[PDB]
Amino acid sequence: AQTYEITYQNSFEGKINQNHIISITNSDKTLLFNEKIKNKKADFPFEVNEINRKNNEVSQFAFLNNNEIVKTSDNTILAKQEFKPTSETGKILGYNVKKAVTSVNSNTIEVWYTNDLKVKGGPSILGQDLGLVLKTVRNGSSVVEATSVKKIKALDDQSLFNGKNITEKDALTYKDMIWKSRFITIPVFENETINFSDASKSDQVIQRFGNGTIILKKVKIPEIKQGNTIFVELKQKSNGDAYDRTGDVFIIPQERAISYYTGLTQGVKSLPVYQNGNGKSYQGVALTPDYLPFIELMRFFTPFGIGHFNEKIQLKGKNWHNNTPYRQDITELRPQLSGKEILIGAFIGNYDKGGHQISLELSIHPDQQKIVNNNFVLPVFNTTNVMEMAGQDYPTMFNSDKGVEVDFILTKDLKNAQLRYITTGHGGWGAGDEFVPKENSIYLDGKLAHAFTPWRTDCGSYRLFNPASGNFEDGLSSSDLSRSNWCPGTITNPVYINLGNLNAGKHTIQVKIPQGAPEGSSQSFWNVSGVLLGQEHHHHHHHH
Ligand SMILES: [Zn+2]
Ligand SMILES: [Zn+2]
């Protein structure tokens, strides 16, 4: 059984493009790969195909990393190809060829093949049972043609597979593993309960605070280079709770002596007290020389009772979704995440014994983006009371004109400074700040820098995530209603407020909001966080 090696060349409309495709074949087996793979210069993931000519078993192999190979196999692929014959004949490289035509996804592919050598093969899977394919033409434009056919001693692919372990998978899993090999996933939580129960307690991996409403762990983040992108993904459903709850995925900056973790582990008294003239006290909401507030990776709101209530609440024409996905790009927080062991947590404020179930992961993608260029991150304030069920007061501070005011010191000039600002308004009645628009005003060094009214009018779009939403006499459901910058079942986007360039030295940032008046025991309040972003330039000698 003589073995042959066929080398191919790609063209577009006469223009020769390359990493040449190679087929190695004899009457028993054929191997399809390319130059870079043959030479062990191909980047992961890469694929090879092999056909067992005794039984037409087609095997696809994916090389995922230096050690891991997956394969998927199928002995029906060749039989399913449908070709139409033509009378066209000719020669390629001295071999007699016939042309046949096939159609895949509206693309037309002409295949020219020889049977002169009593072996089969080709530059792709198409036509592999017809003969040895020496030329393919895709939509009359894209051509792959053999440039040489040579005899060789044997089909020997032992070095290709040497040192690697191979595992057969189903076709869907095979593709999935190739996909996941292209980027880094950092697992955090998988099907974790977030609830309210006196029985809730920490274990050796997950710490739990707020009577079950806060789950926290330490996770190691690799070095992530400037240019890479970073996303956080959370999946949620109700395990009993009917309500639209405030949620956060957060990290805890520990660069100063005190952190939000001090509050969580010791108690709310360990947090610095903030006061602004309104007669009340607030805890851990502002940076001080000894303390940084936590950073919100993603602020989200649960829908009303998704999953748990789906079969319980039947409304004609409403087929409820099973769970809620939330995914946010957090590329700008790279400087706070890169190469650190971080404390990362999830909060859903609720009072339900069944509560909620979530999953959470981070992903890091090998990009070289040039759009988000900050190398500096400083958390300046966070009024969101993640410790709601652990003694932290609601953010009712905005009835004073002083609002939230923070002083901080920059040691180096900051170019393109921005305030990453997440705001939501609360107070759940018709004249409460959940439902009435209020202008948020941001000041830098005592001067107004930006004023805007946070408002969402798209909430009716997410109706099918919200089975337990209350239905009113006017024909609307609670989840439909326009709100101060959130909708049940969705993320609240940060805004990126341009502050210009900042000099080294002392600065102040201030937020003022005309907070609505209470109604009986009901209060309005504002969950606001601010992270300062910017680009510090570098000092450097001159060289070429
Ligand atoms: Zn083989
Ligand atoms: Zn240099």
In the reported structure, the alpha carbon of residue 537 is separated from the centroid of ligand 2 by a whole-number distance in angstroms of: 13
Experimental method: X-ray
* Tokens 């993931």, residue located: 45
- Which residue in the block uniquely carries the two structure tokens 């880094």? 184
Residues contacting 475, CB < 8 A, separation 6+: none
CB 32, CB 53: distance < 8 Å: no
Q: For the chain, how big is the Rg over CA atoms in Å? A: 31
Q: Which ligand is nearest to the CA of 52?
A: 1
d(CA 174, CA 66): 17
| Strand ranges of the sheet holding 214-220, from the earlier edge strand across to the other edge | 207-209, 214-220, 341-348, 246-251, 295-301, 491-492
Tokens read off for 290: 């000894």
Q: What contacts 266, CB < 8 A, 6 or more positions away?
A: none
Domains by residue range for the chain, with CATH: 1-182 (no CATH), 183-371 (2.60.120.1570), 372-544 (2.60.120.230)
Q: Give the integer Cα–Cα distance in Å for 297 and 11.
A: 48
Six-digit token pair at 444? 């830098």
What is the C-alpha to C-alpha distance for residues 417 and 445, in angstroms, rounded to an integer?
Answer: 13
Question: Quick check: 293 and 285 in contact, CB under 8 A?
Answer: yes
Q: Could you give the CA distance from residue 67 to residue 38 in angstroms, rounded to a whole number?
A: 17
- Dist. CA 130 → ligand 1 center (Å): 21
| Token pair in block for residue 458 | 């798209």
How many angstroms is it from 375 CA to the middle of ligand 2?
Answer: 18
Phi, psi of 48 (to 5 degrees): -130, 150
Side-chain-facing half-sphere of 135: CA atoms under 13 Å: 21
How many whole angstroms from 341 Cα to the centroid of ligand 2? 29
Cβ burial of 116 (10 Å; 0-12, 13-18, 19+) is: middle
Whole-angstrom Cα distance, residue 311 to residue 43? Answer: 49
Record the resolution, in angstroms.
1.9
Helix (H) or strand (E) holding 146: strand 142-152
Place of tokens 């959470």: 360
Distance 9 CA to ligand 1 centre (A): 23
DSSP-based three-state secondary structure for 496: strand
Write the Ramachandran bin of 441: left for phi over 0, alpha for psi from -120 to 50, otherwise beta: beta
The encoded tokens of residue 13 equal: 């409309």
Distance of alpha carbon 246 from alpha carbon 526, whole angstroms: 12
Residues with Cβ within 8 Å of 357's Cβ and at least 6 positions away in sequence, in order, are 191, 192, 193, 194, 236, 237, 239
Please return the burial class of 31, using the count of CB atoms within 10 Å of its CB with bins 0-12, 13-18 and 19+.
buried
| CB-CB contact of 122 with 128 (8 Å) | yes
Kindly list the distances between the CA atom of residue 190 and the CA atoms of 184, 223, 286, 398, in Å, as whole numbers in the listed order.
17, 24, 32, 37
CB atoms within 10 A of CB 509: 24
Q: What's the one-letter identity of residue 514?
A: P
Preceding amide of 366 cis, omega within 30: no
Q: Which residue has the tokens 């830098």?
A: 444
Residues contacting residue 432 through CB under 8 Å, at least 6 positions apart: 426, 516, 519, 522, 524
Helix (H) or strand (E) holding 446: none
Nearest to 518 by CA among 428, 442, 449, 445: 428
C-alpha 539 – ligand 2 centre gap (Å):
10
User: Can you tell me the distance from the alpha carbon of 541 to that of 180, in angstroms, rounded to the nearest whole number?
Assistant: 42
Q: Which residues pair with 103 in a beta bridge?
A: 108
**Are 302 and 238 spatial neighbours (Cβ–Cβ below 8 Å)?**
yes
Tokens 């069920």 found at: 389
Ligand 1 centre distance from Cα of residue 419 (Å): 58
Tokens coding 345: 């947590």
CA of 69 to the centre of ligand 1 (A): 13
Amino acid at 513: I
Distance from the first to the final alpha carbon of the chain: 59
How close is the Cα of 174 to the center of ligand 1, in Å?
18
